């Protein structure tokens, strides 16, 4: 492509796109960590039966 002097390029990263991926990732992290708690509670209650 042809050159044009007196210009630079932007970073092609739009904040309106990229400031929702962190919200999605935080919700995914919390939904994954809920499983560790629901596993640990049943593992501790299936060993103090006797």
């Amino acid at each position: 492509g042809k050159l044009t002097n007196g210009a630079l390029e932007a970073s092609n990263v739009d904040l309106s796109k990229e400031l929702v991926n962190m919200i999605v990732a935080q919700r995914n992290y919390q939904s994954n960590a809920q499983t560790i708690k629901t596993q640990d509670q049943i593992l501790n209650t299936l060993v103090n039966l006797r």
């Binding site: 492509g1 042809k2 044009t4 210009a7």
Partner: protein, 51 residues
């Protein structure tokens, strides 16, 4: 972006400078007036870059 607005602001200031100069020189005896002329810009896209 802010770039089109900044370019429009920067273009409309030399147009005031060359009118202030014409106003100030309105009594010298061999003076010739001055006028600026603007033109748009366009990169490879179809939106502008200002003026």
């Amino acid at each position: 972006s802010f770039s089109q607005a900044v370019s429009g602001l920067n273009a409309a200031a030399t147009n005031l400078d060359v009118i202030g100069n014409n106003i100030a020189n309105s009594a010298t005896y061999g003076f010739k007036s001055g006028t600026a002329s603007f033109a748009d810009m366009f990169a490879g896209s179809k939106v502008g870059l200002g003026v």
